Amino acid sequence: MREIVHLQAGQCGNQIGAKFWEVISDEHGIDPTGTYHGDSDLQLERINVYYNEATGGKYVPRAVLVDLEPGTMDSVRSGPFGQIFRPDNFVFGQSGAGNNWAKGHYTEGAELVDSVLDVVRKEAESCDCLQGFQLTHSLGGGTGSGMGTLLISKIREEYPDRIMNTFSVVPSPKVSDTVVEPYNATLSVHQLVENTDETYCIDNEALYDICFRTLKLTTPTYGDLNHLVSATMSGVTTCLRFPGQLNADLRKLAVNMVPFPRLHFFMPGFAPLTSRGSQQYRALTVPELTQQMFDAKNMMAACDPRHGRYLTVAAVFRGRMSMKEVDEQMLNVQNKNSSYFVEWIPNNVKTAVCDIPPRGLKMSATFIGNSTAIQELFKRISEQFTAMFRRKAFLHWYTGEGMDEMEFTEAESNMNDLVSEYQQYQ
Amino acid sequence: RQQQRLLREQRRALDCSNLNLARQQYLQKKQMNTASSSQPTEDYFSQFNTRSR
Numbered sequence: 001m002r003e004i005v006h007l008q009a010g011q012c013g014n015q016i017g018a019k020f021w022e023v024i025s026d027e028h029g030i031d032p033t034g035t036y037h038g039d040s041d042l043q044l045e046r047i048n049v050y051y052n053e054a055t056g057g058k059y060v061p062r063a064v065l066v067d068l069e070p071g072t073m074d075s076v077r078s079g080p081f082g083q084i085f086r087p088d089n090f091v092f093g094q095s096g097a098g099n100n101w102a103k104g105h106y107t108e109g110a111e112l113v114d115s116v117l118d119v120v121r122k123e124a125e126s127c128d129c130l131q132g133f134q135l136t137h138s139l140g141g142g143t144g145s146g147m148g149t150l151l152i153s154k155i156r157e158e159y160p161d162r163i164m165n166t167f168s169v170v171p172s173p174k175v176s177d178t179v180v181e182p183y184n185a186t187l188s189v190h191q192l193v194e195n196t197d198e199t200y201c202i203d204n205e206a207l208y209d210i211c212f213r214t215l216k217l218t219t220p221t222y223g224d225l226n227h228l229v230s231a232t233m234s235g236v237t238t239c240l241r242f243p244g245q246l247n248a249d250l251r252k253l254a255v256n257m258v259p260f261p262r263l264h265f266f267m268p269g270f271a272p273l274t275s276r277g278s279q280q281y282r283a284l285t286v287p288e289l290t291q292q293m294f295d296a297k298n299m300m301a302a303c304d305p306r307h308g309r310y311l312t313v314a315a316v317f318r319g320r321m322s323m324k325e326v327d328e329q330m331l332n333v334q335n336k337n338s339s340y341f342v343e344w345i346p347n348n349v350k351t352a353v354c355d356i357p358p359r360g361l362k363m364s365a366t367f368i369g370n371s372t373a374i375q376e377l378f379k380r381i382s383e384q385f386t387a388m389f390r391r392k393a394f395l396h397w398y399t400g401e402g403m404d405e406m407e408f409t410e411a412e413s414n415m416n417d418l419v420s421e422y423q424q425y426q
Numbered sequence: 427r428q429q430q431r432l433l434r435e436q437r438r439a440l441d442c443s444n445l446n447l448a449r450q451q452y453l454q455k456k457q458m459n460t461a462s463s464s465q466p467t468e469d470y471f472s473q474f475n476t477r478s479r
Contacts, residue, residue, distance in 0.1 A: 015479070215474060223477015272464075276471055284464040321462065360469030 002240050002249065003127035004049055005120060007151065008136040009066040010144030012169055016136045018076050019226035020233055021061055024050055025081065026359050027234065034058040034084050042356060046241045052126070060086045064119050066151075068108055068143040069096040091116050097142030101184045102401035104146015113150050120151075124159065131240065132163025132197075132250055136233075139185045140171040140178055149191040156195045163250050165198045167233060172205035172302050173380060180394050182384045183408075189378065190411035193262055193418060197254055200266045201374060202229060203302040213297060216275040228300070231358070232268045235316055235366035238354045245323060248316065248352035256350040257312045257370055262421060265374045267301040269293055271365035284363060286325040289317075293367040294333060301377065308373025308426055309342045313349045319363035320355055327351065342425065375422040378415055385412060 008017040025031075028047055029038025035057055036044060051059040063085065067073055070092045076082050077090075093112055097104040124130055133155060137144035156164055171181050178184075192199055207228055211220035239247040258264045271289040274282060282288060293315065296304055317326060330349040334341055341348055358364050388394070389408060399405065 019477075217474060221477055222479030224474055226477070227473055272466075274466060274470075279466060279471075284466075285462070319464070357464075360467050362464035 001128045002049060002131040003062065003129070004131050004134060004237065004240070004250075005123055005127070006050070006061070006063040006134050006136075007066070007120065008063070008134075009148040009151070010138050010141050011067070011072045012138035012141060012144055013136050013148070014065060014067060014072050014076055015222060016167070016226050016229050016233075017063065017065070018079055018081065019223065020136070020230040021063065021084070022081050023227070023230045023234055024061075025084070030059055030084070032081050032083060034060060042242060049131075049237070049241050052123075060084060062123055063089060064116065064123070065090045066092070066112075066116050066143070066147065068093045068104065068112065068147065070094070071096075089119060091119060097146055099142045099178055099180055099184070100397060100401070101142065101146045101187050102398050102403055104143045104148075105150050105187075106403070107401050109143065109147035109150050113147065113154060116151060117154060120155070121158075130159075130162065132165060133159075134233075135164075135166040135168075136229075137166070138169040139188050140169070140176075140181045141184065144169075145184045145188045149188050149195075152195045153191065163197050163254070164195065165200075165250065166192065166196050167200050167202060167229065168192065169202050169204060170301075170377060171381070172203040173384065174302070175205050175208065180397070182381055182388060183394065183398065185381050186385045186415060187407070187411050189381075189418075190414050193414075196264065198250075198257075198264050198266065200268050200368070201301045201377060202268070203300070203377075206300055206302045209302075210273065210298070210300075214273045214275070216277065228270065232270045232300070232366050235270065235318070235364065236368065238316065238318060238356075239352055242354050242356040244352070244354040246351065246353045248350075253314055253316075253350070253352075253368065257314060257368070259311060259345070260421075262418065263311065263370065266368045266370055267299045267303070267305070267374065269295075269298045269300060269367040269369075271367070272361060272363065273298075286317075286321060286363075287329060289363065289365040290315075290329045290333065293365050298367075299369075301374065303371070303373050303376050305369060305371045305373045306340065307376065308371045309340055310348055311342055311370040311372065311425065312345065313370070314366075314368035315349060315351050316366040316368075317351070317353045317363075318355075318365065319357040319361075321353065321363065323353065326353060372422050372426040375419050375426075378419055382412065382416060382419075 028043045029036055031037050052062055054060050073090050073092050097108055137148035139145045171185050207225040208220055211217040240249050271293040272284055292298055296306055330351055
């Protein structure tokens, strides 16, 4: 009765969406064929938030799968959990987007956006009270960033009052794997700013930085970065599914977080990350989650919040804990250092507590901070957009799809205002 | 004099009652203290081996 419709597009979208549904299914006791084999009863109580119903105790997810080529839809169906997705939910074209924004947004995606909008309208009209949507896509691509911002513009004009959440993978310039990456990212942030209620900024550099430094993985891979993203994608929805002592759904975490409508770019972090060797040296308590939840070597964005000021802060706890030790640590972190916390908000931290911890741990947490220090991510894109654009570097790929040079001009000034909308609070 | 003796007896009976209550509360908090603090099993380690992309 508070359903969430999950949408994801691209190779980045379908490879986070494949790992995310591996995490929810374990957490609700669903086998790789769809039958409930759990042990407790609270797993089956609110399974309809993410899962539909079929014949014979079979739960098929409420997920929509979009791509512009059939090459990444076959690695989804050939995985461990590929047989639980409904076969109609795969929507795929026949020729790709080619790392082009405009083919995803005007040429190849416009003939495909009217076939996905049939699927999501079939599932949004099967929920008693749909809480909101989700996206998981990539801004450094052609179908995540081109068609994925064409669904958002088309969903928000048909279901406008709901929640439109995204988990965007913004590009990183230290580890970058596409020449024409600054053109796709600049033309999409202009479209995210007016059409999303929330947006979590994830950089692949800041996910490699955790596996080398914190988890001490000698071989990080894309299958291990997608579990850090999926663990915090289910930590924000944990009180819609399990009882607690202080609940928080998705709409409550957006009331206490965005003071002005254009300032909704967050930065996630997940608290108990521990290596195999240093496992036995740590007595994990409430003080030893809030030291890692708030640490600047832990954020899932390649920006340092010691250069800015926290506008607001979230904290979503799990596990059977005490409401006094949780509440004295949020007051403690505010009062020691008042240069990093803004002054026209007197209490910046919002806290929530659930009761059912994740698989294998007995306590966990999640940090969603709203920092002024996220403006150093857009400025660094916009020094490489206009380094290229003064010479008109790769522009003939884009103008030949039916664009103009003003679309590059209007989506550069409109993102340089979001820098100077954040610049007046630091 | 007999009513004063009765008052002393009632106070002693109540004191023995909350003495036994004190013992059972001590055992209650002694199994409360061991069930908050968490340790991770092998189920927390085994997911980071899988996946080769």
